[PDB]
Design a protein around this ligand. Structure first.
Ligand code: P6L
Ligand code: P6L
Ligand code: P6L
Lengths: 366, 364, 363
């Protein structure tokens, strides 16, 4: 018979949605606001706000359909615009589907906000807008379809709870391609980081789709992995430089959050402590190797770390929820690696195409 | 049988309530804080905090009762002070009534915060406090009764989901009457605007009273109408001045949110995109013509109340008018509701300011 | 049969938890950030962030178990580390127990954040870290066990809904002992205060454990008591100094919130108005006589006392337990306050000293 929405789940997920919107408006905007040069802040805030608005529109017009509708292994469909095929009472899992639409839309928003906040007043605004349309449509959307919309990576049992590939790796490589082709308020950075943290609970727990024990797990693991990464990074920084800094504390937080994103509803809390530690160190490594586009280093490295570790610590003998029936750790790690690899290439190529199309049309300079 | 509270609804509504309190403390305070002259900030923040407190007290003493209790077409009652007739387990709709008390009390708070943040250190504080008491009691309270408490406008089938009349038009007119009778931190304005946005999800979806498909519709329409307005305003501003600004982006956001407030749980998402666009442009128009903040709440409030009477129609993607109601009749009711709201609040604001003027005077 | 989690309660309590984490990160950090000297902000924010992280780790390792597991009247146990005895589906009250772990963990975090934000760049960081480990383990944890974990004060029917003893008095005394042994952005203070306020709805209503009428009561009483304290303080300050200030408005808010913390799900809304007024004035008195600790301490004591009066049904509260008189209940409230003060005074002393003798408390 018909799916019926559970009101507790509706409630949960609307609030989670509002918490993820919070992480863009104003979370990410304040994070970049205190990182970039003061002469550029007003214009950065405006470009995050405007592209946020743009993403919201594109999402309901066609983006939700092309990401989550029936299609092939790579794309959904645009058979219906503006949510027209979706009755107001339609249910997806245990919530009204409209709530699923907003929740997933808020994901596209933070993902784009991440990129846009770094590239603002480096590439011309015109060129950001063309990049956003191209890359959302042809990278974000299909990669979401592949991982969460029944496409290719989902059909091979890829594990990515809340978006190590779809959000983090995806965006990291778009930013780095953009960076290749080209701090004044630290309390403001702390504030953004803090907002990003609180919001991420909606991100990570809400990705369970219901207020059940998987969301609880995801919640607890977020707390733990973030804390362990803060300490991971901070100890690494004390060692490497003799003093620990506020920006190091914040970066570590971000590193654990990223690292735990793919893993959070699949692993045990011991797992999460380990993932956090490693992610915190790997992120300190990443930036040290490599300019606000260091942010992409952390999303990228820690995204890869977290997608790998999900394939280990999901195992029931390590405290995780368990692999799917008949799956071995070695097989699963192979699928995690293939998923990472495909995500990197796909987004590299699409980012390239988007930037060039912008360059040849309006140019990338100010 | 007895009404039974649904715990999911309770949960939803307590979180929505906290989100709407958020939009006053600190949302609206930070929004005005970066708009007004620096020499006036500390005193503005204090007055918003104090009057917020005052509203909370008046609300539980008599305000909730006079707004939502059985009365007239215009007022409820004050038969019981301090929620005394309300058992702890009493249920209103699908939630404990105490939650309905806090939710609606947070609405009075943001409404007043709106007015107070603009009038701080223009009219003396004494006079703000007299104005607040008079106008909350005699404008906010009866207009809420008329629209959401079974009074006059609700009995004619007026559509106003979350307060285009009650909050926006009502407050716009009080502010403008106050303005007639008399920008240093733009990142702070962004922050306030952002908090106002996040909170507004509690405002708008919470006005459904339950975590159902109407709250979901309200949620999605808020996302969409805000985004469309941001763009609406921003494209208008690029045209009119050659450059788009951060303050324009934020104003657009506010315009869509105001515009979608009355409409949000009655219209379809296509409707919401249209409303947002128009509300964004109408708000850019409003300020350009011209406490500009009141221009936007007022013009966009009127825009949204009108458009609710169109796009609520099933053939336009809305939830549908009540049985036997035509679009033309419904538009007529929307207009009557707007008209009555403007006069009622204009007259009561006048009375409140004068009473303050004649008692303490309206400066230093 | 087995306890089954109610999903609405899960949802409610995960959100409440996030709201309490919010009060530390960034709430308390911004509150202290605008109070302390500018030269010290960056380092204060770092120390709050790091000790927050530390508390989260210690909590899941052993702290939750030692606070809420079966033990004696004072401590739980550490029979299992890292939540190992807790199945993912285990239920505590009407929620998954993992949610209870996070909710109570976020309490330990704000309690510590309160202390750490005041002592940062006064006492060396080394010494803060030793103090935190000692005092969380030996003061926060057993006092939570005693009040909410079935220990001594709970078995005598002590009333403390959301932590007038456990959080406020406990932390006040640790801070004052620390202060004895040793404002540049007022809008930032307002912001922190506002975040602390919003977060406190999760603190206070969430302490009911479920989205029911007790959480509703707790919610409403938080609105009302905070408002009444704002006014209480502000009228007191106008009188005492001729002008009311933004910092006074914020301090009053904090005073009503502290005051109403123990009382909030036991008293009626008339009770809450009175508690707020008194707490606002008692806090203005306290500071007038690390002033932050004065307010948490006085208003914590005020609230724990008033809980024992206004919980009475004849005053609009939910009622004392069967056979309990107001006089008996006040006696218990006093005994609880007294024990909390001495216990945390003694443990704070031990912690600071151990730090002093190991690293300095200076530089
Ligand atoms: C708005 C334009 C943005 C859309 C443009 C972006 C897409 C670019 C890449 C092309 C691949 C997309 C794609 O596969 O999209 C689908 C078509 O619609 C579209 O959305 C095609 C797009 C039109 C293709 O599958 P279909 O035959 O419906 O179902 C196949 C099923 O096996 C049999 O049912
Ligand atoms: C500070 C107090 C607010 C002062 C402002 C009060 C308003 C003054 C002008 C409008 C009067 C209110 C009003 O119109 O009327 C209300 C009563 O008002 C009061 O309780 C009396 C007034 C409430 C006080 C409703 O009438 P009631 O006879 O109780 O209902 C009985 C029956 O259900 C309907 O027939
Ligand atoms: C300030 C310096 C001086 C001190 C003043 C203190 C402040 C005033 C408050 C003082 C006392 C509270 C009143 C007593 C109630 C407490 C007992 C209580 O809980 O309730 C008392 C009851 C009467 O007994 P009951 O229980 O029915 O019989 C039981 C049984 O049936 C038997 O048969 O009702 C009232 O007294 C309600 C009185 C309402 C007062 C109006 C206030 C504001 C109106 C609008 C205007 C808004 C406010 C304007 C003024 C601030």
């Amino acid at each position: 018979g018909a799916s019926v929405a559970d009101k507790a789940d509706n409630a949960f997920m609307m609030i989670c949605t509002a918490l993820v919107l919070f992480m863009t408006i104003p979370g990410i905007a304040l994070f970049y606001g205190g990182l970039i040069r003061g002469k550029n802040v007003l214009s950065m805030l405006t470009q995050v706000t405007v592209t946020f608005a743009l993403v919201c529109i594109l999402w309901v017009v066609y983006g939700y359909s092309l990401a989550f509708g029936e299609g092939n292994n790579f794309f959904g469909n645009i058979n219906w615009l503006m949510l027209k095929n979706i009755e107001l009472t339609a249910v997806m899992g245990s919530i009204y589907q409209y709530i699923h639409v907003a929740f997933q839309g808020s994901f596209a928003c933070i993902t784009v906000g991440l990129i846009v906040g770094a590239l603002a007043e480096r590439i011309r605004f015109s060129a950001v807008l063309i990049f956003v349309v191209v890359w959302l449509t042809l990278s974000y959307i299909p990669i979401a379809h592949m991982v969460w919309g029944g496409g290719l990576l989902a059909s091979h049992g890829a594990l990515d709870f809340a978006g190590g590939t779809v959000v983090h790796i995806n965006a990291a490589i778009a930013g780095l391609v953009g960076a290749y082709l080209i701090p004044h308020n630290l309390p403001m950075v702390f504030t953004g980081t803090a907002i990003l943290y609180i919001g991420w609970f909606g991100f990570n727990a809400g990705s369970a789709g219901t207020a059940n024990e998987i969301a609880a797990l995801a919640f607890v693991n977020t707390v733990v992995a973030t804390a362990a990464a803060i300490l991971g990074w901070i100890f690494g920084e004390w060692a490497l430089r003799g003093k620990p800094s506020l920006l190091g504390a914040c970066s570590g937080a971000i590193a654990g959050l990223v690292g735990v994103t793919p893993a959070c509803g699949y692993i045990g809390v011991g797992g999460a402590l380990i993932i956090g530690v490693v992610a915190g160190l790997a992120g300190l490594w990443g930036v040290t190797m490599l300019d606000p586009c260091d942010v992409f280093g952390v999303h990228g490295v820690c995204g890869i770390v977290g997608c790998i570790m999900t394939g280990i610590f999901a195992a029931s003998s390590l405290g995780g929820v368990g692999f799917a029936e008949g799956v071995t750790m070695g097989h699963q790690l192979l699928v995690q690696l293939e998923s990472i690899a495909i995500t990197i290439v796909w987004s590299g190529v699409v980012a390239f195409i988007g930037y060039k199309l912008a360059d040849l049309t309006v140019g990338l300079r100010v």
